[PDB]
Every structure is written in C-alpha cells, then in structure tokens.
C-alpha cells in the first residue's frame, strides 16, 4: 500500500506528500487517529485534503491512507431497517463498538454487517448470459422487503457457478465468466454517491401515487417518479403529513434523509419513525425504510452528502424494480452545509453566500429521481418519488434554495401556519399549492375509474377559488348581501373544506382514503351543489334548502368515517340528496 | 491529435498539463481516465510548455498519474448539414434521438463570425406567429430579435412550442426552418417539447438542441451557440428563413456565473460576470439578413425574470441588445389568460417594417393603434375603481373598462393550440371596434371595404 | 525552542520544530522572564504558526523562546467548581483554593450520537410567567434570548439564574454561567447578585471581560460547556447554561478570522459561523441512560435590532425557539419586556400538560396568545382611526392587552412566579374575556 505523509495542518485543511497514486474526491484516513478526509487537490505528489472531523492534535510527519475510492455506499442485505449518518455510518453499531454515547473521531465502521449469515436463494441457472441489473437470486432480508441480488455494473458474461445457501455479504455467491476471466460476485456492491446509478431509459411519471390523503391525491397529486416540495413551517403539522405519506403511499421502500437537523428535532424522527406501523403487514415501518440522520453539530461534509447518500440507496432499490419514496428534511439545511463547504474551499461567493452551482446541485439531485427502465434483460420498471422539505428562515419562499427547487419540481404542498391556527388539517393551502401532474393524473384517473373525475376535480377547485372571491365580498361588506346562488357556493365550499380537505391522520378510517372512496365522497358533495343549484332555478330558496337538509348534510360530514368495506353507504347519499331536494320543490 | 500523460496538477474543475507543445487557446481536449472514462475539456490558458484546461464533466475521480489528455487540434465546432432537419441534438451537437449520425458538409466554429456592417441588410418582412397579440401590436420581422420576458410560474414553454408550430412566412416559396434551443431544462420539460414537436409534425422542419438542467454548465453555454451556428448555416448557405427559439436564457446566465466562479473571476454586478452584456451581445447580434443572400435569422430568446424584476442584469442587458420584448404577467395568467401577454408594456421596435400592405392588411397599422388605445383606457378606468366604487362608470368610462374585458377574453385568449392567420386577427380586433362607435376613434377614415 | 523567526501581529513563527500538533498550547518565555500562553494555528514541515493570547508587544525574537506543552486547551474539572468563579480560560478569580482537578478535558467536546440522544420531557420553572406558560423551557432544550443593547437582558439572565428550578426537585439543579466580552460593571453586577441571593453556591461562573483577549473570548463558551457536560453526564446533575453576550462571541470570531486573514463570509462574518455556533448550542440535551442533562439559554444582542442579522438568524436557526425583548415595552416600563408574539418554543409541548404541569396549560396558552394579538392590533389600528372601532362592542382587549402587558408580562426581575401562580394569573386576566370567546373547554367553568 502507498502511504502518504502529512506536511501541513491548517484547520480542516491537510496537505500530505507521497500521494502520487491518489485520486480526486478519494476518501482518506488522516494521521495516527485516521480521521475521515477527502482529497480536494492533487499536485502531485502532494494532495490537499479536506478533513471532515476535528484535526486537533494532528501534525506533519503522521501517515495518510487513501481508501482508493470516492464516498460510496455499501449496497446489500443488512441495509434495510438501519439508521445511518450522512456518510452511511451505522449509528447503533457505532455505539456498540465505541461503547460511547458520542461520535468519536477516527472510528472506521462498515455500513453493513459483514459477519451476519443470510440465506441466498439462487433463481438464475448456470450457463445463462447476464449483464448489469440482471437478478441472479434474492434474500428475504426483512419481514416485508425481499432483497434482490443484481449483477453489478461493469460485469457481463455467462454464469459459470451459482448456488443457494448461507453466506455473508463477503462470501462469493456466484462466479461469472467474462472476457477478462472468472469473476466472483458477492451479495453486496459499492457505489459512489455523487454518481447517478445508470439506467436503460427514463420515463415520464404519469402513474399517480396514492397517498390516501384526500387533499393531495385529488388536487395536488404526485406521480411515481415525481417530486414535491413542502414549506414545513412550525406548528403546521409537517411531521404528521410526512408520516402519513411515508407509511400509506404506494411505494415499496422509504428513504428518509435528515440533513443536519436540530438535535432534539432529529431525536423525534429517530424515535417516532420506528414506532410507525406498516398498514399491510402490521410490522414496524422500519422493515421497509432506510433512514439517514444528521445534526447541525455533525461534519458538514456528512450533512452535505446526506441527500446523495440517500438518493444512491434509493436508486439501488429502484434498479430492483421497486417504487421508492425518498424524503429529505430539510433541504434548506443541506444547502447550508453546501454554502459552508463553498467557503472552506474558498470559492467565489454566489447568491447570498450559496455557491454559484447551488441550482445545479439541486437539479442533479432531483433529476436522479423519476420513473425509469432499470438495467437488465427483463427491462423492469422502477421509480423514485421525491418529497423534499424546504425551510427558509422567516418563511420566505423567495429565497435561492426554495426558488431553485420550485424550478425543477412540479408539485408544491404549501403548508400554512394560518390554516393550522384555524384547526384545518392537513394545513395545505389549496390556493397557493399546485401540481403540474394534475392533467396527466386526471386522464389516468378517468381511465381507471370510468368516471369524469377530472371534471369533478376542476369543478371542486373552481368552487374553492369561487369562495375566495366571494369571501372578499362578504367583508366590505355583509354576508347577507350575497345571492342565494352565491350563498350556496359558499356552503359547498364549506363542505369541500371540512367534509373533504380536513382529514384526521389519527382516526382509524379517516387516516387513509382509497381512490374509489375519494370519488364517492366528492361525488356526493358536488351532487349536493348540483341539485341545490337545480332547485334554486326551480323557485327553491337557499334557507329552505339548508334548513331542510341538516340530516343529509350530516351523513356527508360522516362520509369520511365510512369503512371501505361499505362504500355503498356513501353512494346511497346521492339518492337521499335527489330525494330530499325533490321534496323541497313543491 | 496529441496525447499526453503528463498531467501535473488538478485544482477544482481545472487541470494542469506540462511538457506539452503546439497547444492552442480554447482548443478542445479529451481526458481519458484510468477507468476508461472520457470527458471533454477546453484550454483556458497556455503558457510556455504548460496548458490549463477545464473539464466539462468535472474532475472528480481523476487519477493524475494514470490519466491521459488528448488535444483535438480544434475548438468547439458543429458538423453542419442539411440532414439536421428533423433531428434532436445535444448542447454539444451529438445525436439524441438514437438515429443515424450525420455526415457533416463541414465543421464551423460555434462562435460564428462578425458580419460586416456594410454587408448587413435591414430586416423584413412580416412573420406570422399565429398569435394575434404578437402580429399586432408587437409584430415580428425576419431578422429581428424579439425576446419573451416571463416568470417561473408563467407558461412560456407553452408559448414557445406554439410559436414553433405556427411560425411561417405567408407567402413565400423559400423554406422556413426552425432551430429550437433548450437551455438547462428538466427531463420532463424537454420531453414536453419533444412530445409536442412530433405530435404536431413540427419536428419535420425543425432542428432541436436539447440541453438538460443536469448537463455540464459548459454545454449549457455552448448550446445557444450550437443552435445559431446551425441557423446561420441553413440561412446564409441554404437560403432558408430560420427562426431560432431559446429557453431558458436565465439558465444560460446562471451557467455563465457558475463557470465564471469556477475560473475564479471577479463578478461585475449581481454576482454575474462583467462581460455578461458582451456575452449576450455576442449571441443576440447573430441575427438578421445579408445583402445578396436569400435566407435570414430571427431570434426569439425566452427568459424568466428573477424576482419579477426587469431591472435585473439579465433582462436589462438583453433589453439593451434586443429590439423590443414580449411581456408575460401573472395577473393575466392567474386569470386564465392564454397566452398571458400584457400588450401594454410589450413592444416591437421593428414592427413598422413587417406590417406592410404588401405583407399585412393595411387595416393593421391603424387597427393596432386603435386596439391599444381602447384597451389602455379600458383597463385604467377599472384600475382606479377598483378603489372608487366601479358601479356604473361616469359616461362611457364604463365602456372603456368593459371592452378592455372582452379584449382579454377573446382577442388575447386565442389558446395555445389555435393558429390565427393575420387576416383573422385583423377582423377580430375590428370586431371589438365595430362594437365600439364610429364616433370614438383613432382609426382610418376609409372603413372599407371591410 | 529558541527558534522564533517571525512575529507579525499576534502571530509568531517557530522553526526547527518536530512533533508539534494543530491547536497545541504553547508558552512563550520572553527575554525579561515574562510568560505568555499561545495556541498553534498552523503547522508546516519545519515551522509552526502560533497566536499569543496576551498579545505580542515587547517581545525580543532572538532572546525569547517557545515551548510546546503537548496538549490543547483543557479544563480542570471537579465538583469543587460549584460556587467558584473563573476567567475565560477557567482560572480562579475569587482568590479561593486552587481546585484539584479529577481529570483534564478538551473544551471542544464530542458530538452526541443521534440515537443516543433522549427527548426533552421535563419542565423547567424559570419563575417567569411569560416564558414558563407562553414559551415553556424544557430540560435539554436550547432556548435563546434575543435583545438589544442597553436592555435589561442582563437583569433577565440573573433572574432566571436565581429562580430556575425543577419541580421534580432532583437530583440537583446547577447553573453554569458564562460571561462573554462584557464590561466590568456587568460582570460585577452578576458577581454581587449571585453572591447576594446565594445563587453562587449553586453556580459555576466563567467571567470573560470586554477588555480580555479575543481568543480567550472564544474559548469561554467552550470552557463553560465542558464543565456543564461534566456535572451533568458524569455527576448526574441538571445543568442550566446561561451565556452572554453571544454577539460579543461573534465579533471575536471576526477579529480572529481577520487576524488569520481568512476570506470574509456573508454579511461580514466568517463562512463557518453556523457550524461554529452549532458546535456550541448542540452540546445540550438529555442522553438515554444518563441521569443528568444540559439545558442552554444563550443571550445575544441584535445589531440595529435587525432580526435578519446573521447573529440572531443563524442562532434561531440552530436553537429551538427564542425569547425576544423589545424596546417599546422597556421604555413602556415592562419587566421583563417580552413580546410573546415573535417569541417561540419548539419543545413547549413535550414539557407541559398534566403530570408535569396543570391541565389547562395548553388551553390558556393559546387563548392568551390569540386574544392578545387582537389587542395589539386594536391600539395600532386605533391611531389611524381615533379609533373608529366601537369600544361598546370591542373591547377591553386593549385593557386586558394593556394590563396583560402591564400585569402579566411585567412581574419584575426579582419576582418568582410558580407555574401554579402563572396559570392562575392567566384566568384572572382571561376573566375579562366572555364565554363568547371560547378557550375552549368545559374546564373553563372548572377554573372559572
């Protein structure tokens, strides 16, 4: 091995000579302590190294070792259910090995358990021609997720030897015959986090993700492979929304990324997330998710590499043919790490201190998500749907981080403290929120439901915006001044707001609304307005309609609490509406 | 082509290669990495046996000792050919549609040339974009630079695609080609243009240069130059009338700023390089007509104004180089106005040369003036009361207001997929007027034959 | 070593050295026999850069020498630090017996493993109704105070330093007080006040004056935190850390950052201010399996009273909420002056409720916060109007608002209000409001 020697130590910057065979962006072990570092510049043979950890007590003469590779993640059995830091160090194993409650420097740990015995089930037969992405076998890694072992990128040929049995992630489970001779394969593969894992072809994300949350699925839906942003102001219940999306969504795996958060706030995630239950299995949600956790106190490089470490892992399960959801919170705190790394590199200050490539880095991140045709002869599909939290100080969405994010994402769920203070949950602003997947998702919904769903949605939103204009009229002045037709529109808007948009995540039935149930719920709310409107044109009056529909409006209010097993109790509401309104017309 | 394995040092996106000879400034290079990976580069500086190059795809993962650099012996060029029509390209001019590579007629420096002032010819004639708000009162002329000022929220991408389809020269026996340049846009945005171009068959007469948001910043800056080099080839060598559309120019300026920071250069204004103006002028001047030649080059640069500020160094400098601008506002768009063009603040300096009796109905010059005047006064009455009770307006001030209203909903709101001929545009604008009285006017005395 | 070869500003260069480490402490033996401590800033192949704490004036290069101690800044920790007063470097300033340290610790500390951290669950009674009820302080939380120059935050700090207590009553509450770059009169105000009320017998004070070296001004907070973590994580104490003035700490970073000729970051401060501040503030909280806990209350003055300023902005971006003092209330006579509107506590939910506080804590908090907001709006809107708003309909809000500001928030810097008294004062001020204004709860009749 080629070992370098430290010739200078100035803060986080370390220079070492005898590093001629080093590569840019290579990770190193600096000094006797062997603290984690990254090669920033080559001379050669003198390498400039940015150290992630404290350099206190280190001086010239001490050794430096290149790991021979850039920041990479270990991808194989044992990754699911684990909690890592920004550079994929196992936090629990870190506590066991060090016997400490703290992250000491110079501590090196593999991301995964290399001693653990897994059962590998070979599903591919010998003599088969394979290439990158081909599935040779699988492992039942958790109670929920089945780990599929793929041929690593760069491998191509025929399977000479393959067999089932108990192995560690270091044991050769398969032998491949290549142009360059025989090559052993293990259950795990490494990959640089700053490089997007290759694919066959990228597809448009047009298949809607069922979050089960009525406001989102209906008015601001996100597709599988789409990206959404969330303002997450304090008290707006942003955490509860994230939990709802995480465990109810259509996706197979969840990848949560906490980028340098407050200690106590990051503590909430680490504790509450394992407490989340998987709806289908009843198992812990962690049987289905990989979690990254960073505090502002931790190394800025780990905080900055957090989302790239996560997206890499997300891409990995995507290549298997799975749908992944990756939550980043908070990307605004990630940008802070990037901004600081810009200064430590002494780069030209971009907008407001952020690097001039801030917009680019964000684009590189979100463009690595989406629907794709994975590598492999079977040409299976996979997707990465991104839910990112933005947190500008002072709640200014005008700032660089949020601005550039909205430049590349097509969905925005504007969480509002105002709605939260008004007991409206989820507190998503239906006026300022948007979804550029609405048209595409609408066409999809109509085809699968055999209904004019897209019309129903646009009508409901037309009413919502209709209300906002009528609301301006009520003040300045007088609610009574308004016509029976306008007064009716306000009540229909009240219905949509309270009977549909407001959803209690903690209620057994109201916590999740199926696609078919959302249709019936909105079809009874709108048909109430249609009949009431038809009644008004038939000499009927607003008051005579309202006072004579307290009972049927009661059912509509309780419609959200109706079990999926008895959807007919919702569709029958339309009968009672057409029957009651006809009674008022005499 | 020279190849050296003497790469001395690597700092940021830059490399130093020593013991080199015969290397020139702005020469293209290739980095053949130890892993067999290839990356394009550019000579920023050459000094006495050393060459400083910048790598487009970055320098991450490069091993100095086991890497080599090929000096191609030329700068960024475009393999211009007629077969480019109906094809989709990189920001670097590489096939992006999986079709057969083009055997170029010749290679041209993407920087282009500077036209001789006496060789340049004034621009006409009229170009029909099918969008009424544009043919009057902000008419487009062959050889003009007429930019669109937009916002992130606004639908310029829809407006851009509609112009690419409806653009034509009625009537002319000469060919009309469209060069479309996508600058730093997402996969879905690019997929949008690709899907629209082929769905309408507009790709059959277009050359598309697609640069994505996650492509190298260098390729972003080279994209508009790749397009213009192609446009001028079709225009001045093939005698075609070429319309060049570029989006998003805001992304282009960011790449300039991004690259400028990497090269460690002091920023002139707003963090942007001092030569941002000179760099926009280098681009925008590559439009117009040549005396003796048939073809022409018209530019429609589309940009989003940061923070909706027009005084921003991006739209400011563009305004200093482009003759007029088409303004899009959120107030209109939010009102379901498509395209949301505010014809008031909008302008076309060269409009008078396109609206010709030989080229456009003579009703146009007057009709445009009349339409403007009527809308303007209409909007204003509404603008104040508004504050005062609108109620029924004093006299016909209410009438001003009300026909301004109709004006947005049927004249401007043609729809992103409706192609209005200039004749139809004129009739409708008048249709508002017929509803106005002959009594109130700025219009022609001979209200005939129509 | 007698190989000093350069002295430029507060910096010195030493040659022919080997084995010298970064941030290693050094001593300068001057020609006159005087000794000065220094810190290693940078180490090269044969030379090292060091910055002398007490300056560089009067030094003879050839006749002076440098010796490398072989360790960084360390704090001699001991339970005997209770009731003792120190400088920015943790040296006795009370003429008391030199404490025999149990061990020496680096003042930098280590990051807590996120899965080792424990959630803040315990309520801390500061005795201040404005905080305890409206913006509750929780054990293990970092809740800063934002103020302006000339304001009584110094008075507020001492008040909290005296009245701070845990209802649990165990194991024992301790106060690590860190003074940063404050004047003699401020420091003296704290010394007498602590010794007077006897709060000193429960406190560990680190005093750094405004005329002290900039470097020592930077080490001060880390000295205090190192002691605090020791008393908490090794002695099982609940340590409340108070620090002032953090704005002085920021200016100390600029002076050093400039002296080391580093590239200025945004707004004229270093580009590492966020992490440098986080490395201090994130040293609080509870550890799973450990009895003790560290709670922080940083106090900073806001330049130009601007909240968008880097100091208060980066701080609030790291801390879980903040307490804000206004200039309108102070001149108005309020004590302490605290606009509960901009104030916030991100952990007030995990420390309140039955079991740790009374049952109507969450209710009265929301009511006083909402009802007040309309009171402030009235008086401001009343000016332009006269006001046009009819007091017949509404309201005593202002009177309640005025009296609330006058009687609720203003309690004096020497008044200790238990959470029981605070909640009682809530209803009696809420008594002005009618049933028409819902709290809302059936327990409203429960407490009237």
mmCIF file with all atom_site columns, C-alpha atoms in Angstrom, chain A residues 7-11 55-60 62 83 91-92 94-95 100-104 234 260-268 270-271 293 295-298 300 303 332-333 336 339-340 346 352-353 391 393, chain C residues 20-23 41-45 72 110-120 140-142 233 263 266 271-272 274-275 278-279 282 285 287-288 290 313-314 316-320 344-348 350:
data_model
loop_
_atom_site.group_PDB
_atom_site.id
_atom_site.type_symbol
_atom_site.label_atom_id
_atom_site.label_alt_id
_atom_site.label_comp_id
_atom_site.label_asym_id
_atom_site.label_entity_id
_atom_site.label_seq_id
_atom_site.pdbx_PDB_ins_code
_atom_site.Cartn_x
_atom_site.Cartn_y
_atom_site.Cartn_z
_atom_site.occupancy
_atom_site.B_iso_or_equiv
_atom_site.pdbx_formal_charge
_atom_site.auth_seq_id
_atom_site.auth_comp_id
_atom_site.auth_asym_id
_atom_site.auth_atom_id
_atom_site.pdbx_PDB_model_num
ATOM 1   C CA . UNK A 1 7   ? 3.349   18.082 5.529  1.00 0.00 ? 7   UNK A CA 1
ATOM 2   C CA . UNK A 1 8   ? 0.852   20.701 6.702  1.00 0.00 ? 8   UNK A CA 1
ATOM 3   C CA . UNK A 1 9   ? -2.141  21.089 9.016  1.00 0.00 ? 9   UNK A CA 1
ATOM 4   C CA . UNK A 1 10  ? -4.198  24.284 8.968  1.00 0.00 ? 10  UNK A CA 1
ATOM 5   C CA . UNK A 1 11  ? -7.684  23.851 10.391 1.00 0.00 ? 11  UNK A CA 1
ATOM 6   C CA . UNK A 1 55  ? -7.914  17.964 13.165 1.00 0.00 ? 55  UNK A CA 1
ATOM 7   C CA . UNK A 1 56  ? -6.875  18.968 16.684 1.00 0.00 ? 56  UNK A CA 1
ATOM 8   C CA . UNK A 1 57  ? -3.743  17.148 17.820 1.00 0.00 ? 57  UNK A CA 1
ATOM 9   C CA . UNK A 1 58  ? -2.584  16.287 14.306 1.00 0.00 ? 58  UNK A CA 1
ATOM 10  C CA . UNK A 1 59  ? 0.699   17.463 12.801 1.00 0.00 ? 59  UNK A CA 1
ATOM 11  C CA . UNK A 1 60  ? 3.213   16.876 9.984  1.00 0.00 ? 60  UNK A CA 1
ATOM 12  C CA . UNK A 1 62  ? 1.919   11.494 10.508 1.00 0.00 ? 62  UNK A CA 1
ATOM 13  C CA . UNK A 1 83  ? -30.116 4.294  10.705 1.00 0.00 ? 83  UNK A CA 1
ATOM 14  C CA . UNK A 1 91  ? -25.197 4.800  14.410 1.00 0.00 ? 91  UNK A CA 1
ATOM 15  C CA . UNK A 1 92  ? -26.145 1.801  16.558 1.00 0.00 ? 92  UNK A CA 1
ATOM 16  C CA . UNK A 1 94  ? -21.042 2.970  16.332 1.00 0.00 ? 94  UNK A CA 1
ATOM 17  C CA . UNK A 1 95  ? -22.392 2.934  19.884 1.00 0.00 ? 95  UNK A CA 1
ATOM 18  C CA . UNK A 1 100 ? -19.922 5.562  23.849 1.00 0.00 ? 100 UNK A CA 1
ATOM 19  C CA . UNK A 1 101 ? -22.887 7.915  23.504 1.00 0.00 ? 101 UNK A CA 1
ATOM 20  C CA . UNK A 1 102 ? -20.787 10.157 21.267 1.00 0.00 ? 102 UNK A CA 1
ATOM 21  C CA . UNK A 1 103 ? -19.337 10.128 17.755 1.00 0.00 ? 103 UNK A CA 1
ATOM 22  C CA . UNK A 1 104 ? -15.602 9.909  18.376 1.00 0.00 ? 104 UNK A CA 1
ATOM 23  C CA . UNK A 1 234 ? -43.625 25.378 12.723 1.00 0.00 ? 234 UNK A CA 1
ATOM 24  C CA . UNK A 1 260 ? -28.116 18.347 9.672  1.00 0.00 ? 260 UNK A CA 1
ATOM 25  C CA . UNK A 1 261 ? -31.195 18.935 11.813 1.00 0.00 ? 261 UNK A CA 1
ATOM 26  C CA . UNK A 1 262 ? -31.529 20.221 15.371 1.00 0.00 ? 262 UNK A CA 1
ATOM 27  C CA . UNK A 1 263 ? -30.500 17.584 17.904 1.00 0.00 ? 263 UNK A CA 1
ATOM 28  C CA . UNK A 1 264 ? -33.856 17.376 19.660 1.00 0.00 ? 264 UNK A CA 1
ATOM 29  C CA . UNK A 1 265 ? -35.810 17.535 16.401 1.00 0.00 ? 265 UNK A CA 1
ATOM 30  C CA . UNK A 1 266 ? -33.673 14.811 14.818 1.00 0.00 ? 266 UNK A CA 1
ATOM 31  C CA . UNK A 1 267 ? -34.351 12.849 18.009 1.00 0.00 ? 267 UNK A CA 1
ATOM 32  C CA . UNK A 1 268 ? -38.079 12.947 17.258 1.00 0.00 ? 268 UNK A CA 1
ATOM 33  C CA . UNK A 1 270 ? -35.173 8.600  15.206 1.00 0.00 ? 270 UNK A CA 1
ATOM 34  C CA . UNK A 1 271 ? -37.680 7.599  17.887 1.00 0.00 ? 271 UNK A CA 1
ATOM 35  C CA . UNK A 1 293 ? -29.812 11.132 10.395 1.00 0.00 ? 293 UNK A CA 1
ATOM 36  C CA . UNK A 1 295 ? -27.435 17.066 13.278 1.00 0.00 ? 295 UNK A CA 1
ATOM 37  C CA . UNK A 1 296 ? -26.080 20.564 12.618 1.00 0.00 ? 296 UNK A CA 1
ATOM 38  C CA . UNK A 1 297 ? -23.383 19.660 15.133 1.00 0.00 ? 297 UNK A CA 1
ATOM 39  C CA . UNK A 1 298 ? -22.053 16.930 12.832 1.00 0.00 ? 298 UNK A CA 1
ATOM 40  C CA . UNK A 1 300 ? -20.660 19.495 7.222  1.00 0.00 ? 300 UNK A CA 1
ATOM 41  C CA . UNK A 1 303 ? -24.640 16.808 6.138  1.00 0.00 ? 303 UNK A CA 1
ATOM 42  C CA . UNK A 1 332 ? -32.652 24.104 3.279  1.00 0.00 ? 332 UNK A CA 1
ATOM 43  C CA . UNK A 1 333 ? -30.267 22.812 5.939  1.00 0.00 ? 333 UNK A CA 1
ATOM 44  C CA . UNK A 1 336 ? -26.404 25.477 4.441  1.00 0.00 ? 336 UNK A CA 1
ATOM 45  C CA . UNK A 1 339 ? -22.752 27.008 1.438  1.00 0.00 ? 339 UNK A CA 1
ATOM 46  C CA . UNK A 1 340 ? -20.208 26.387 4.193  1.00 0.00 ? 340 UNK A CA 1
ATOM 47  C CA . UNK A 1 346 ? -12.556 29.489 -0.711 1.00 0.00 ? 346 UNK A CA 1
ATOM 48  C CA . UNK A 1 352 ? -26.477 35.216 -0.668 1.00 0.00 ? 352 UNK A CA 1
ATOM 49  C CA . UNK A 1 353 ? -23.360 33.166 0.043  1.00 0.00 ? 353 UNK A CA 1
ATOM 50  C CA . UNK A 1 391 ? -37.247 25.616 5.456  1.00 0.00 ? 391 UNK A CA 1
ATOM 51  C CA . UNK A 1 393 ? -35.810 31.457 7.709  1.00 0.00 ? 393 UNK A CA 1
ATOM 52  C CA . UNK C 2 20  ? 4.090   19.853 17.055 1.00 0.00 ? 20  UNK C CA 1
ATOM 53  C CA . UNK C 2 21  ? 0.342   19.415 16.576 1.00 0.00 ? 21  UNK C CA 1
ATOM 54  C CA . UNK C 2 22  ? -2.519  21.659 15.454 1.00 0.00 ? 22  UNK C CA 1
ATOM 55  C CA . UNK C 2 23  ? -4.226  23.652 18.225 1.00 0.00 ? 23  UNK C CA 1
ATOM 56  C CA . UNK C 2 41  ? -2.811  27.850 14.335 1.00 0.00 ? 41  UNK C CA 1
ATOM 57  C CA . UNK C 2 42  ? -0.945  26.025 11.605 1.00 0.00 ? 42  UNK C CA 1
ATOM 58  C CA . UNK C 2 43  ? 1.910   23.540 11.400 1.00 0.00 ? 43  UNK C CA 1
ATOM 59  C CA . UNK C 2 44  ? 4.179   23.187 8.398  1.00 0.00 ? 44  UNK C CA 1
ATOM 60  C CA . UNK C 2 45  ? 7.085   20.848 7.673  1.00 0.00 ? 45  UNK C CA 1
ATOM 61  C CA . UNK C 2 72  ? -4.602  21.838 23.667 1.00 0.00 ? 72  UNK C CA 1
ATOM 62  C CA . UNK C 2 110 ? -17.781 15.457 21.160 1.00 0.00 ? 110 UNK C CA 1
ATOM 63  C CA . UNK C 2 111 ? -20.964 15.164 19.110 1.00 0.00 ? 111 UNK C CA 1
ATOM 64  C CA . UNK C 2 112 ? -23.769 13.181 20.733 1.00 0.00 ? 112 UNK C CA 1
ATOM 65  C CA . UNK C 2 113 ? -24.882 10.119 18.775 1.00 0.00 ? 113 UNK C CA 1
ATOM 66  C CA . UNK C 2 114 ? -28.383 10.969 17.445 1.00 0.00 ? 114 UNK C CA 1
ATOM 67  C CA . UNK C 2 115 ? -29.692 7.548  18.514 1.00 0.00 ? 115 UNK C CA 1
ATOM 68  C CA . UNK C 2 116 ? -28.137 8.065  21.942 1.00 0.00 ? 116 UNK C CA 1
ATOM 69  C CA . UNK C 2 117 ? -29.901 11.379 22.496 1.00 0.00 ? 117 UNK C CA 1
ATOM 70  C CA . UNK C 2 118 ? -33.090 11.489 24.558 1.00 0.00 ? 118 UNK C CA 1
ATOM 71  C CA . UNK C 2 119 ? -36.156 13.679 24.032 1.00 0.00 ? 119 UNK C CA 1
ATOM 72  C CA . UNK C 2 120 ? -36.708 16.678 26.348 1.00 0.00 ? 120 UNK C CA 1
ATOM 73  C CA . UNK C 2 140 ? -32.336 19.507 27.446 1.00 0.00 ? 140 UNK C CA 1
ATOM 74  C CA . UNK C 2 141 ? -33.537 22.320 25.204 1.00 0.00 ? 141 UNK C CA 1
ATOM 75  C CA . UNK C 2 142 ? -31.648 25.311 23.834 1.00 0.00 ? 142 UNK C CA 1
ATOM 76  C CA . UNK C 2 233 ? -23.078 13.445 32.265 1.00 0.00 ? 233 UNK C CA 1
ATOM 77  C CA . UNK C 2 263 ? -11.948 35.186 3.385  1.00 0.00 ? 263 UNK C CA 1
ATOM 78  C CA . UNK C 2 266 ? -21.780 36.744 4.098  1.00 0.00 ? 266 UNK C CA 1
ATOM 79  C CA . UNK C 2 271 ? -18.340 31.347 6.424  1.00 0.00 ? 271 UNK C CA 1
ATOM 80  C CA . UNK C 2 272 ? -18.116 28.899 9.317  1.00 0.00 ? 272 UNK C CA 1
ATOM 81  C CA . UNK C 2 274 ? -23.194 28.450 11.523 1.00 0.00 ? 274 UNK C CA 1
ATOM 82  C CA . UNK C 2 275 ? -21.223 25.310 12.363 1.00 0.00 ? 275 UNK C CA 1
ATOM 83  C CA . UNK C 2 278 ? -23.993 24.860 16.268 1.00 0.00 ? 278 UNK C CA 1
ATOM 84  C CA . UNK C 2 279 ? -20.966 23.116 17.776 1.00 0.00 ? 279 UNK C CA 1
ATOM 85  C CA . UNK C 2 282 ? -25.877 21.337 20.089 1.00 0.00 ? 282 UNK C CA 1
ATOM 86  C CA . UNK C 2 285 ? -29.969 17.864 25.775 1.00 0.00 ? 285 UNK C CA 1
ATOM 87  C CA . UNK C 2 287 ? -28.721 11.289 26.965 1.00 0.00 ? 287 UNK C CA 1
ATOM 88  C CA . UNK C 2 288 ? -30.605 7.996  27.113 1.00 0.00 ? 288 UNK C CA 1
ATOM 89  C CA . UNK C 2 290 ? -27.875 9.059  31.829 1.00 0.00 ? 290 UNK C CA 1
ATOM 90  C CA . UNK C 2 313 ? -30.679 34.487 12.305 1.00 0.00 ? 313 UNK C CA 1
ATOM 91  C CA . UNK C 2 314 ? -28.117 31.678 12.465 1.00 0.00 ? 314 UNK C CA 1
ATOM 92  C CA . UNK C 2 316 ? -32.504 30.838 15.914 1.00 0.00 ? 316 UNK C CA 1
ATOM 93  C CA . UNK C 2 317 ? -31.803 28.504 13.010 1.00 0.00 ? 317 UNK C CA 1
ATOM 94  C CA . UNK C 2 318 ? -29.900 26.285 15.441 1.00 0.00 ? 318 UNK C CA 1
ATOM 95  C CA . UNK C 2 319 ? -31.842 26.798 18.668 1.00 0.00 ? 319 UNK C CA 1
ATOM 96  C CA . UNK C 2 320 ? -35.366 25.521 19.310 1.00 0.00 ? 320 UNK C CA 1
ATOM 97  C CA . UNK C 2 344 ? -41.386 30.742 20.328 1.00 0.00 ? 344 UNK C CA 1
ATOM 98  C CA . UNK C 2 345 ? -40.531 27.423 21.964 1.00 0.00 ? 345 UNK C CA 1
ATOM 99  C CA . UNK C 2 346 ? -40.226 24.327 19.776 1.00 0.00 ? 346 UNK C CA 1
ATOM 100 C CA . UNK C 2 347 ? -40.399 21.908 22.713 1.00 0.00 ? 347 UNK C CA 1
ATOM 101 C CA . UNK C 2 348 ? -43.075 23.536 24.884 1.00 0.00 ? 348 UNK C CA 1
ATOM 102 C CA . UNK C 2 350 ? -43.023 17.926 25.491 1.00 0.00 ? 350 UNK C CA 1
#
